[PDB]
Subunit: 252 residues, 4 copies
């Protein structure tokens, strides 16, 4: 069967009560009625290393970045899930820092599958559940769904469901009675119905795009050097699409 | 046959040379090789009224807003196109004001159909071409594609292609030789292949979601009043998800 | 004698009731108690041409762009005001298209003050009023206030005041009783008090920065060509800060 | 003697070479030439706990969030610094998750200066250094500087300096020769000059705003309950500022 993986990216460790979890609790039985098996992971409960290392970095400095953690376990669940729902509180008009770490680490998956010539997360479907006290839902949805789009996820219409109160400091979903908020409840239902349909579609008729071939055709029509002259004689920062400075020619 | 409509939202009237049109000129033959009938509209060439009126406004003040313009023609083309590609320059880290006016008027389309019980632009596909001198493509992509998804568009992976120069004032795509810019050329090819595929899928197996039925289910599990107490005794704007202010008792 | 100019960027013509105008009506008497002269302009009531032309465009295509409108009148007012307050409704998680046009045209300035070597809007102060039915205030503040900062405006703390209802379709400020909304009313008071203080400060102690001399220091430490090699052999879009492609050597 | 604190929020531990540190290395001598004592902290080098606990959470599970870490050490520096410069690489069109955590924890302060009745970070100045491979500088600047403004920071004009390559995957500042990039080098000079000036101003003539008095005046003109009726009989998500549903009357 198809699988939906819902990542609660709250910053409070289980079992502390999460506002965002209220939206998850509505979505789970709806996915199960669709025949889509659900799993909820609260990512902050798990040891996921934030630090970065590759071979350009200092070798000893990277020991902590290279340590054994729980990321392979979580990455494998994401690879296996046909639907990825990020369920995030809003902080600083963004997703939480926990969602941010996960997405940073996930952005290793724009390289290739040997037989599809597609990124590893191609043919999957993304949805979004968000909870804020007042503001930021559409901004976060734009940022997060755009990034997932870059990785291979398809986004159906009305794929982001959320709760917000009025302009103010709070309170959140629980005291604000968001479990009976009509607009949120109808958005959650839209999102589940549409992500489920698109997931079944992509299971039957995946993209056949060969990104390697697209890239080769693009190589055969492009240069391998970008170069432009800069006007260094002005403090101005106003935009000029035509600057008439002269084109550049490259050494040998 | 499938139709793709590409809206160049440059602020300069034809035949003035448009940087963004360079990306369009790459995309059109690629769609035509996909078997998809393409049409390019430069919306600024057409008389589209920006002012708003509805029957809550003053009747005389709204006369200019109600005047006969070319919006019904353009709206009918959007309704007919299976793929909508917004092709916009970046201004102020946003789409152009012309794209903005078009999207404002298009967001009247969030009500139902017959028959399908879906918004009128359901089962369509969105992609994005963008051109800026230096910065803003992913921010604009998040904003524009999120809004199109609210209307019923589905978004495939890698649906946004763009050109940008380095940090600076420009110049633009033409002087910058973007027509031979590898990254842009490959993204344009990704976008055309993926949008064409998703359009063919949705032609054959559209969403069957009944938004009316989703809304009726939400109504049964929801209140028809939102009400919270407010802490009027503090200058603080720190978020507080629990405030223990007491419930609001509502009459009738 | 300081002047504050408040631009209501609603899309509905006077005298139609504007939701955003409710916040302006709170702010005006507060500024006047500060001893600051205030003027409110509803910009949609004035003829401001959106289209663009310069010498690189087609002459005949640009005739409409070059026509007589009310922009010189409005631009002179912005230039003269010590405090600019954009008072914008939210559309599509952005300011309105009317605000978008004004800012597009305001960004077309290409001057440097001969005596101070600064942009024309240096030493002015920016505040923000916003009104939306549910969502978008901090995103719009980020975008608009970042753009004004690039032009020369300084931004005090708590410079953006706004009203929003809960997640939903509305209603707006008037039916939602925003005029008695504590959070909005206290933010408006913070905004007026802080912008007023900062405006007075800059009137006594303006920036003495010499933008021309900064740019000349930068010219001495910088190249006049930007050039990089591009990896044209991969479909990957993964970010690689080091790519081992070789330096490009330019011939001048 | 003013203090400037520069937080490098790279995800790579010292002494691994950071692209963003290149911009920092330009700014530090410019600040010291202004007579400002400058400290650089690479926050990822320090053990700062990401998890959240307060007394509404689960005591037992909150033990890790409550643990002794290095946050008080870093917060003291932020409390003392007259200028805070966030120096962040761009990930996912945002600041890094490391910057995200720091700002999250900074936003948890709940204090009012007993004498000035201002938030604790009032009268400070914020600036920004950013480094990305291609895109996101103005979006990050909007988000980060809007958040610091809510905390009490003032933002001068041209307070955000950055480097970006063209559309693509990289490379970054070092291989792209950003240390000799004219646009970046001049923006760094603008930013140091303007933040230094504004910090000196605010040390002389701080804001005298009484936030508590402002909130008390807002309390007198406002309701202590927010309540609106909802239309539960539509699937539409079209925005409607006027819905004629009727007022909510609240008991007692
Ligand atoms: C540091 C910080 C920043 C915030 N930025 C925003 C914002 O910018 N906008 C908003 O509307 N709300 C914001 N909130 C409230 C919020 O979202 C959470 O409390 C709630 O949702 C809890 O969910 P959870 O119980 O599942 O963890 C923030 C709270 C923070 N601690
Ligand atoms: C007022 C204003 C603002 C801008 N804001 C940004 C921005 O924030 N970022 C960027 O990278 N570029 C920006 N540009 C350059 C740009 O985009 C166009 O010139 C080009 O693309 C034209 O394309 P076209 O020939 O098809 O019209 C702006 C230019 C403006 N006139
Ligand atoms: C097309 C369109 C899009 C919108 N996008 C958003 C959004 O993204 N978020 C929101 O919260 N609200 C939004 N609204 C409501 C809104 O803002 C205005 O009606 C109000 O403010 C009127 O103010 P006024 O009477 O002074 O003109 C939109 C309304 C639109 N017509
Ligand atoms: C996961 C991920 C995401 C990214 N998202 C973006 C983006 O959205 N836009 C951009 O322009 N660049 C991006 N980069 C490159 C970047 O910024 C850094 O490598 C550089 O700056 C290193 O700086 P440092 O050596 O001081 O750490 C990303 C890189 C990542 N590892």
């Amino acid at each position: 069967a198809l699988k939906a993986l819902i990542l609660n990216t709250t910053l409070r460790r289980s079992p502390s009560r999460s506002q965002t979890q209220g939206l998850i609790d509505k979505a789970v039985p709806l996915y199960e009625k669709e025949g889509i098996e659900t799993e909820v992971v609260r990512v902050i409960d798990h040891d996921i290393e934030q630090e970065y290392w590759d071979d350009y970095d200092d070798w000893n400095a990277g020991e902590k970045a290279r340590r054994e953690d729980e990321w392979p376990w979580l990455l494998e669940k994401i690879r296996e899930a046909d639907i990825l729902v990020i369920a995030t509180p809003i902080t600083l008009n963004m997703c939480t820092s926990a969602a941010h770490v996960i997405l940073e680490k996930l952005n290793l998956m724009d390289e290739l599958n040997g037989d599809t010539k597609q990124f590893p997360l191609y043919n999957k479907v993304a949805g979004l559940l968000m909870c804020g006290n007042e503001d930021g839902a559409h901004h976060v949805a734009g940022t997060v769904l755009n990034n997932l789009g870059r990785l291979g996820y398809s986004v159906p219409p009305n794929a982001a469901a959320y709760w917000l109160g009025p302009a103010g400091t709070g309170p959140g979903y629980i005291e604000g009675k968001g479990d009976r908020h009509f607009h949120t409840n109808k958005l959650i239902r839209f999102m589940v119905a549409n992500t489920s349909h698109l997931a079944r579609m992509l299971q039957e008729t995946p993209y056949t795009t060969d990104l390697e071939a697209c890239a080769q055709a693009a190589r055969e029509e492009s240069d391998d050097v970008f170069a432009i002259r800069v006007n260094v004689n002005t403090p101005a920062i106003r935009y000029k699409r035509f600057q008439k400075l002269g084109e550049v020619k490259v050494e040998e």
